Amino acid sequence: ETRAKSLLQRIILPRPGEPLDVRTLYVEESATNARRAHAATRTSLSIGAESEVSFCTYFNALPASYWRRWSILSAVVLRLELAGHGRVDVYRSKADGSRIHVQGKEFAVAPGTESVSVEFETDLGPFEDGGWIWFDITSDTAVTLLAGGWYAPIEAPGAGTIACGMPTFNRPTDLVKTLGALGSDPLVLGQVAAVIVADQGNRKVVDEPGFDEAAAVLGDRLVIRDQPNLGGSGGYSRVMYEALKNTDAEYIVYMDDDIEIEPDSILRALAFARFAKSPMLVGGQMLNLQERSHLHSMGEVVDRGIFMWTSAPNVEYDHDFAKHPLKDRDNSKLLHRRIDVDFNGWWTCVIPRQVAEQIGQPLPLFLKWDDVEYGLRARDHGYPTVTLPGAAVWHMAWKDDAIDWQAYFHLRNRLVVASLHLPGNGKAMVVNTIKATLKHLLCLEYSTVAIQNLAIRDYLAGPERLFQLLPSALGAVHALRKQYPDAVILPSSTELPLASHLEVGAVAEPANPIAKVVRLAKGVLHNLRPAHARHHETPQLNVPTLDARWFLLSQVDGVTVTTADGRGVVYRKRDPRQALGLFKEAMRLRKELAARFPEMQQRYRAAHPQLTSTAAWENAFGLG
Amino acid sequence: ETRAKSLLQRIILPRPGEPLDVRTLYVEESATNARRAHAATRTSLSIGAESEVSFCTYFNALPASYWRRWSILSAVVLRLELAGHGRVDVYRSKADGSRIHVQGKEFAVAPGTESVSVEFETDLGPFEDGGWIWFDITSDTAVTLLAGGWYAPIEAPGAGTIACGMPTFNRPTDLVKTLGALGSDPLVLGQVAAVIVADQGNRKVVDEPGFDEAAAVLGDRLVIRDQPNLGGSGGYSRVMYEALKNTDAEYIVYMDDDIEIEPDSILRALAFARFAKSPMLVGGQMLNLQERSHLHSMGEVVDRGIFMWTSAPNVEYDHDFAKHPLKDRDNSKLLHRRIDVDFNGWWTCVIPRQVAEQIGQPLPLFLKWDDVEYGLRARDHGYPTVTLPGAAVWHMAWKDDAIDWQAYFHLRNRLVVASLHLPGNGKAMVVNTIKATLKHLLCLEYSTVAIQNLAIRDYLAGPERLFQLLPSALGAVHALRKQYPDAVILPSSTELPLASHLEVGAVAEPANPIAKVVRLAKGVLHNLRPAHARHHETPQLNVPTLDARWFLLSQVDGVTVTTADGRGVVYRKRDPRQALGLFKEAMRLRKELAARFPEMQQRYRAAHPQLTSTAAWENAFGL
Amino acid sequence: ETRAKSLLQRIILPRPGEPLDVRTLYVEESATNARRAHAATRTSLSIGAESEVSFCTYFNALPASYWRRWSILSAVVLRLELAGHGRVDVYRSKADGSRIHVQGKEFAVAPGTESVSVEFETDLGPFEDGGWIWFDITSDTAVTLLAGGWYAPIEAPGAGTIACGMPTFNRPTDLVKTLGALGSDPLVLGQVAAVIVADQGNRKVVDEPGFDEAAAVLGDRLVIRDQPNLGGSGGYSRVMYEALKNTDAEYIVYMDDDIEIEPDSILRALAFARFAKSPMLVGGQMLNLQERSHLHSMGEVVDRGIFMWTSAPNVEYDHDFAKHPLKDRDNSKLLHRRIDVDFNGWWTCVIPRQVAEQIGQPLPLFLKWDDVEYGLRARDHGYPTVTLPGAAVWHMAWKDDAIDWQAYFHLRNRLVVASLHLPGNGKAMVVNTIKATLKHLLCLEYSTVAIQNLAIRDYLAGPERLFQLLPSALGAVHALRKQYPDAVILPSSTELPLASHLEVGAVAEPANPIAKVVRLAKGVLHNLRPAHARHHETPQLNVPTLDARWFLLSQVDGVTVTTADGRGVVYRKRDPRQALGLFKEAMRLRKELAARFPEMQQRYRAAHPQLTSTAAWENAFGL
Ligand SMILES: [Mg+2]
Ligand SMILES: [Mg+2]
Ligand SMILES: [Mg+2]
Numbered sequence A: 001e002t003r004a005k006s007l008l009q010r011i012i013l014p015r016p017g018e019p020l021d022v023r024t025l026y027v028e029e030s031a032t033n034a035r036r037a038h039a040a041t042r043t044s045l046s047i048g049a050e051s052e053v054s055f056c057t058y059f060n061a062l063p064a065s066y067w068r069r070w071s072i073l074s075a076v077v078l079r080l081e082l083a084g085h086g087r088v089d090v091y092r093s094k095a096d097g098s099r100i101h102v103q104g105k106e107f108a109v110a111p112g113t114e115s116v117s118v119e120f121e122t123d124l125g126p127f128e129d130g131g132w133i134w135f136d137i138t139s140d141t142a143v144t145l146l147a148g149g150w151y152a153p154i155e156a157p158g159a160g161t162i163a164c165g166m167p168t169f170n171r172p173t174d175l176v177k178t179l180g181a182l183g184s185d186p187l188v189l190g191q192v193a194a195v196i197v198a199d200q201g202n203r204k205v206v207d208e209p210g211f212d213e214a215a216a217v218l219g220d221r222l223v224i225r226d227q228p229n230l231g232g233s234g235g236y237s238r239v240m241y242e243a244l245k246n247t248d249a250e251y252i253v254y255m256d257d258d259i260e261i262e263p264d265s266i267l268r269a270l271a272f273a274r275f276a277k278s279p280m281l282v283g284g285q286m287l288n289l290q291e292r293s294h295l296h297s298m299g300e301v302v303d304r305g306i307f308m309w310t311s312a313p314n315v316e317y318d319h320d321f322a323k324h325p326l327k328d329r330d331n332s333k334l335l336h337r338r339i340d341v342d343f344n345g346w347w348t349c350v351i352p353r354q355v356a357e358q359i360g361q362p363l364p365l366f367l368k369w370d371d372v373e374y375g376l377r378a379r380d381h382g383y384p385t386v387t388l389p390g391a392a393v394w395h396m397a398w399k400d401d402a403i404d405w406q407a408y409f410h411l412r413n414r415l416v417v418a419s420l421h422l423p424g425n426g427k428a429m430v431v432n433t434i435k436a437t438l439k440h441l442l443c444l445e446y447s448t449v450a451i452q453n454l455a456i457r458d459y460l461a462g463p464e465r466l467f468q469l470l471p472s473a474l475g476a477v478h479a480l481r482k483q484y485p486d487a488v489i490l491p492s493s494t495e496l497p498l499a500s501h502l503e504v505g506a507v508a509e510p511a512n513p514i515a516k517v518v519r520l521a522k523g524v525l526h527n528l529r530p531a532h533a534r535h536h537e538t539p540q541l542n543v544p545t546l547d548a549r550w551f552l553l554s555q556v557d558g559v560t561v562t563t564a565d566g567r568g569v570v571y572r573k574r575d576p577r578q579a580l581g582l583f584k585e586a587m588r589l590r591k592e593l594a595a596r597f598p599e600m601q602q603r604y605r606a607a608h609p610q611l612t613s614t615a616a617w618e619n620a621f622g623l624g
Numbered sequence B, C: 001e002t003r004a005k006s007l008l009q010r011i012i013l014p015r016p017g018e019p020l021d022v023r024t025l026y027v028e029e030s031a032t033n034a035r036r037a038h039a040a041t042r043t044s045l046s047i048g049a050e051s052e053v054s055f056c057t058y059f060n061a062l063p064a065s066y067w068r069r070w071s072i073l074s075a076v077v078l079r080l081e082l083a084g085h086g087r088v089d090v091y092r093s094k095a096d097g098s099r100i101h102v103q104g105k106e107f108a109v110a111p112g113t114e115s116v117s118v119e120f121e122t123d124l125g126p127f128e129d130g131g132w133i134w135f136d137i138t139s140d141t142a143v144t145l146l147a148g149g150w151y152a153p154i155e156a157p158g159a160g161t162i163a164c165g166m167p168t169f170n171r172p173t174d175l176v177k178t179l180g181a182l183g184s185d186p187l188v189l190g191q192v193a194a195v196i197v198a199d200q201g202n203r204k205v206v207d208e209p210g211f212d213e214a215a216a217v218l219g220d221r222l223v224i225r226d227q228p229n230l231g232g233s234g235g236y237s238r239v240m241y242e243a244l245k246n247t248d249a250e251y252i253v254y255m256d257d258d259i260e261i262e263p264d265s266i267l268r269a270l271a272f273a274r275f276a277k278s279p280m281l282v283g284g285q286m287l288n289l290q291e292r293s294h295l296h297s298m299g300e301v302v303d304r305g306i307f308m309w310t311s312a313p314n315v316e317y318d319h320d321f322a323k324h325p326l327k328d329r330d331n332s333k334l335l336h337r338r339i340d341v342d343f344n345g346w347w348t349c350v351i352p353r354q355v356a357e358q359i360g361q362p363l364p365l366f367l368k369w370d371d372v373e374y375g376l377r378a379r380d381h382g383y384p385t386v387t388l389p390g391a392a393v394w395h396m397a398w399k400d401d402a403i404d405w406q407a408y409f410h411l412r413n414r415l416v417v418a419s420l421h422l423p424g425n426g427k428a429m430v431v432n433t434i435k436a437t438l439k440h441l442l443c444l445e446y447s448t449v450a451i452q453n454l455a456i457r458d459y460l461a462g463p464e465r466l467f468q469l470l471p472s473a474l475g476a477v478h479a480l481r482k483q484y485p486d487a488v489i490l491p492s493s494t495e496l497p498l499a500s501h502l503e504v505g506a507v508a509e510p511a512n513p514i515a516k517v518v519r520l521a522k523g524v525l526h527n528l529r530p531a532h533a534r535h536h537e538t539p540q541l542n543v544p545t546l547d548a549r550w551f552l553l554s555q556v557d558g559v560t561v562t563t564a565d566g567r568g569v570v571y572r573k574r575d576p577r578q579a580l581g582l583f584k585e586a587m588r589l590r591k592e593l594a595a596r597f598p599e600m601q602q603r604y605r606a607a608h609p610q611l612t613s614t615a616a617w618e619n620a621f622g623l
Helices: A065-070 A172-184 A211-219 A231-246 A263-274 A353-360 A372-378 A406-421 A427-442 A446-460 A472-482 A513-528 A576-611 A613-623 B064-069 B170-182 B211-221 B231-246 B263-274 B353-359 B370-380 B406-421 B429-444 B447-458 B463-470 B473-481 B512-525 B577-604 B614-620 C063-068 C172-184 C211-221 C230-245 C263-274 C355-359 C371-379 C407-421 C427-442 C448-459 C473-481 C513-526 C576-595 C597-612 C615-620
Strands: A008-011 A043-045 A052-053 A075-083 A086-093 A099-107 A118-122 A132-138 A143-152 A163-170 A194-197 A221-224 A249-257 A282-288 A302-303 A310-311 A348-352 A385-394 A560-561 A567-571 B008-009 B045-048 B052-056 B075-082 B085-092 B100-108 B117-125 B133-139 B145-151 B162-168 B192-199 B222-226 B252-257 B281-288 B300-303 B310-313 B347-350 B386-394 B557-561 B569-573 C006-010 C045-047 C050-056 C075-093 C100-107 C116-123 C133-152 C160-167 C192-199 C222-226 C251-255 C281-288 C299-305 C308-311 C348-352 C385-395 C560-561 C569-573
Touching: A008 A263, A043 C251, A065 A385, A075 A086, A075 A132, A075 C211, A086 A118, A099 A118, A118 B085, A132 A143, A163 A172, A163 A231, A163 A263, A163 C160, A172 A194, A172 A211, A172 A263, A194 A231, A211 C045, A221 A231, A231 A249, A231 A353, A231 A372, A231 A613, A249 A263, A249 A353, A249 C263, A263 A282, A263 A348, A263 A385, A263 A613, A302 B300, A348 A353, A348 A385, A353 A372, A372 A385, A372 A406, A372 B370, A406 A427, A406 A446, A406 A576, A406 C348, A427 A446, A427 A513, A427 A576, A446 A472, A446 A576, A513 A576, B008 B263, B045 B577, B064 B386, B075 B085, B075 B133, B085 B117, B085 B512, B100 B117, B133 B145, B133 B512, B162 B170, B162 B231, B162 B263, B170 B192, B192 B211, B192 B231, B211 B222, B211 B473, B222 B231, B231 B252, B231 B614, B252 B263, B252 B353, B263 B281, B263 B347, B263 B386, B347 B353, B353 B370, B370 B406, B406 B429, B406 B473, B406 B577, B429 B447, B429 B577, B447 B473, B447 B577, B463 B614, B473 C615, B577 C230, C006 C263, C063 C385, C075 C299, C100 C116, C160 C172, C172 C192, C172 C211, C192 C211, C192 C230, C211 C222, C222 C230, C230 C251, C230 C355, C230 C615, C251 C263, C263 C281, C263 C348, C263 C385, C348 C355, C355 C371, C371 C385, C371 C407, C371 C597, C407 C427, C407 C473, C407 C597, C427 C448, C427 C576, C448 C473
Parallel strands: A163 A194, A163 A249, A194 A221, A282 A385, B162 B192, B162 B252, B192 B222, B281 B386, C160 C192, C160 C251, C192 C222, C281 C385
Antiparallel strands: A008 A143, A043 A143, A052 A132, A075 A118, A075 A143, A086 A099, A086 A132, A249 A348, A282 A348, A302 A310, A560 A567, B008 B145, B045 B145, B052 B133, B075 B117, B075 B145, B085 B100, B085 B133, B252 B347, B281 B347, B300 B310, B557 B569, C006 C133, C045 C133, C050 C133, C075 C100, C075 C116, C075 C133, C251 C348, C281 C348, C299 C308, C560 C569
């Protein structure tokens, strides 16, 4: 007689010996409890007498606003199996984090039996701008939650079969763990029709220890394809090609090879994609793999002025649930607002087969902006994208991605997608790139300016080169970078002579803004003077990563800057002649870009159907 | 199968009944734990079920940046012996204290066995500017850590034999405690080849109760010598002399006679010196003996402008770990930066035998600026000094060391080392000493100005007088100070008449700098008028230590000031004639110093091999 | 073998079921302890395994500064008896609250025996400006402190016999409870030779239930004497007379009939009075009876410029140890300084027999300014007064003591004592009383000025009327006050018609000081116009106690003000002619006082020996 029909989200609990900071993602235990809640299994919990455990957490709370805005559901059904005497209280929240009591039931096991069912049904009405639904358990005796989860009162449409896919490149140790975690949960395995791997490196995962057991667990689902290193674009395009050609799944699940999979997130994203009103992309969120209690972002959009991907409104990066729980209205109010996004990353993303077969294959961009363009294309075809809170995987956050080789792909493809979606003349984007070049030159980052000029040149060459540059651009970018001293990395600062500290002045951040202006003037005047070769062989300062800002780099001639991860240093040397030459070349290229932008818009929008075609990608993979 | 090859740092735990604030130096227990962790032994811990214990502490976290910058080690190995069912998560940090989860494991004891081994291996890659490596234990059941420690994956070079040495002076009880603690650890005794003591006081340690048991535990290693009071310089010089002459050890371990020795710190410094790329000095840090949970300084450098020793960059004094643990990124982020130092104190310092035989013996400076000069000499000879975190010893911190007799030895030697490592004319140092003399004369500290003039006069006498002033300057400084009223310490303010509180106005510090300037003007105008003798007999105020600042001593004629430790008072009296005369004499001496500084530089750089030779110190030891 | 000789202070512990906030005066348990410490008796504690208990509390910490400044002791001996396995750590503090570790010992009961002795001896050296000495107990297993206390390493001078004395007036229940508490401790009764009571009321203590048992416990020490109500002055004078005539005790102990006695405080004050360098008055502190975890004052002095009793330097009233313990360096630093006082209250005060026989009897002042004058006379006769921390009793603090009848005795006796100890012409005191009269007239407190004028008149009547006004001033003040509407208390504001709120403007406290000035101007202008009789029958506002300030009372014609304890209201009314006449009379009397001040000084200083004679008080007692 239960209203529960289809499972949407299980009540998952931490692992044996889980760190205390990560436990906040599952349960919010009250400090007044004289005993910590012991998690016997991954779906059961054991709390002692006179204890209160709140499930207003990132994993066990239901985002009712998302299930109201995009799902065909009118109400949700909470079901719990309990043993012992206690009470379960169901609360909801508004768009500003205010707690509202919904219902409450005092439960106890009937004598003669062993367990008791507690069931609530709450409408998705008051969640127009945001809000969650959660439940707290306040025990009178020793209470044990045997099982629980959220349900939809109607059966799930379709079959729900999914084809997973991960592009890998010389990361077999992590791919083995990913496949094992994918095959560990039988509920997830029951929905997987294929597991597609695109090995683009030389160290094949087949030759990795621990691979055969996970492969036997997955059975015939595992399909590994070898191909040249075509980057993330080529890898995910091969995944989608295999899923659309050789598997009969209803949803393609883009994943990454270096993620820690929470298996219930896949089921949550699948159930959300199945109950959607219209076909839509359902992506997952990212938790920091190094700080596992941190949610990296609630959602991402793209500023259409300068055309640049940024955080969605009411979103702040890096949220620590251990320090600021979901109940904290001071620091976690923005988490109670429904976040509307333009795109979602491919670390975990669900694409319906209809959307994939209609809008086509990814663009041959190798890396960067390959997911933003796909999200924008899906939106233009009438398919929105939702970053579903609760469904997430663990992956490393973002370092020197705007300085190293990536600074090439970040710019070129930025100009490509802008050719396909930026409305207007694009002068604001050119001014943004001009000031970015100014900053790069003032910070003694000349290889970045060189490779960005190369990116502008390769972009102005037309879309007909996009498939030729797919496997050969990275080599040229690397060869151009390694000819500048600021790109060659050393083991440590000891490989150079000791810091002389000669001719060093004020290099600390200014306080008042007039000091900022006078230091900018000082830095301009200093960069105008010819440098001293003395500081090109013996560095002046050993500057860390965070101390390497403009107010320090604009007053030096030669400085060792420590890399982001702290594994080495790079010797940046100031050269007025080369700086002026790179600036002149960048301004020439940007003027030509501002002049030819309508032509490039037309050409890229005309070549887009040929770039997303299946035959062109078949020729790219070598299946001619 | 284990990658462990050389023990570098043992996981040590607090003593039975250890104070809670001191326990934070070893373990960081979570407040949500229902039961406090019980340390059965000093090398094992027992935690209850569903508890978490973090080892990101001052004694159980490896300073990976130091073992990357100066050691030949490419990686470290963490080996743990555990009983029960739980999980061990090894983390690291960056230069700003960002916690990076490195690697986790879940352990359980198989049925039929008594314990399990948990081993990790982590490279020393991402530690260019700083960072630690630690591990946390989250228990599912009752979990007992039987043993654990850090291990280098290669064997240790050499033999690891050490010769420890402590100069003592009328402190036999603390020396007996130190000798007992030195021979308490078997792993430490296994590496000690000699224990040299230089008794310079009348109260001999051989006549102290409890000495014979510690002597029998140490064995033939204990070697006690007797010599006149030649200060710390002479004591450590005698220690190094005996070590290089009669012992075949590979390292000399300078220690102090009044320290509480953490035994594993000696082995940590030894392992850090043995795995060094080039020979180097591996000094230890100093924990406050009175506040046993505080670390005094991460390291010390010397500013070459005014030439003065101070805290290294990114170093603040007095860091309480009980209040600000290592995990606190708000108040402990500076402890995650690799601190480069110029020298290290001789409360615990490791000097390789090669370095000692090459650079020589300490200078005959008696007290102050001896370890600084020795570190700078080692640096000039191609040997750096590193203050290794985690390897520390308890000892008192610093009070009146800028007013009492030490103000002599601190200034004179400050000039001596300035004749050796100060590039330039040295006018900045002279201006700094001029303004310091101004501060002293405004604070009615005339004895300090007098002994500083005496220090300048003795420094301008040349290096030939150094060995003559080694056993004779202290008595002269005492006889000079006992002629001033501000240098005579009374038992209490009760020995003087009651405070009159007459003619006492603005003595509380103001809040605006304009008022600071007008009060400085008031004090300048007050130090010009002839003082009233009535206030030189009956004091005006009974001022405590903290209240004795310039905004009070410049508006008074006679005041009793309480000493730093609070065991007495001193009667400071203002005299315009004597103040002006001392100022004139100090200015004349500093003019002569600024004029003759190149001459003194040449004289001290030429006579350096003679003052650091074995024969001169043998003549000084009475040998 | 033990250096302990004389018991100075026992380590006392809370009562069964003691409130948590009161437990902070005895023990400071660590919040991390899994179990709260249980005190099976008042002298034993039982702490569980892995727990820390700090005795740096108000009762179990030794004020080393006071035992160094006023006592002949050179050190203090801490002796404890412990069962179990743990560690004791003795700490001290400086004058600013910095914790300095002194010593530490690990204890464990030897096999066969049941308890072990732990003994420390610490010199009273570094306590010139302040500081305490305490000990912390950190357990390993179950630990039980059976008994402990502080000791002097020399025997106590004299016998230590004390004669107690408590004046009472119609308080039989509290006096019986006080007698029971005084007789409950055998260590206190062993020193008590007499318990003197001066029953000055109609209801006698002899007819109170529960009196016979306390009387039988006290034995023949209880000496009750009946006499007319002569106030506190007469009661304490009769107590001193009886103690000096009919008992052979060494120290008189003034107590109050309505205090909750901590019995060990008496022994602490006695030990401090015996070991003193010179004879001195060792008084005790006052803990708030309504907030038992609060200390009212660390000490009291008297400002000589305007001659008014106030808090001593570095003394803040009302210190809550439950919220701000002694270890809190931010909110309890001032408690770590030695407080020098001018006098001490008579709720608990030890006066040596020599001092009492020499300086004489208290002055016949009825109430107020008697203990101040006695302390000043003692100080003039070379006998200082010291308020000893740790030795305290519980008693009510202070309300309306500046508006009711007490405003009379406080002013008159303020002048009298001034005539004995005020250097100069005393114009500042007259100006202070003038501005106080201005404030009283602004707040519609006309009876206060009406009785202050009577006080100025009776003071100018000469000291020959002091013994005549002893049993007659209270009735005159009462009959004069009850003729004013602001002094007649009503059961509630419901006795008057409801508040009309008519002609009520700005009554909230101004923000910027310019608003304060303009509101003072408005209030001055409002007191110039004729008052409307309408507001004299129906009140305008029902103003609480804390809201009855000048900024509200200076802009009204008739207001009900609630009394301090909240048991009634008074209908204050404004009358411009009456206020003007009271002001004129006050100015006349104050100009006459400022003119005749040297005359009254000479007269009172000449009459003081006759007013403190035994014959005059024998005449006053009816003997
Ligand atoms: Mg990846
Ligand atoms: Mg020392
Ligand atoms: Mg009373």
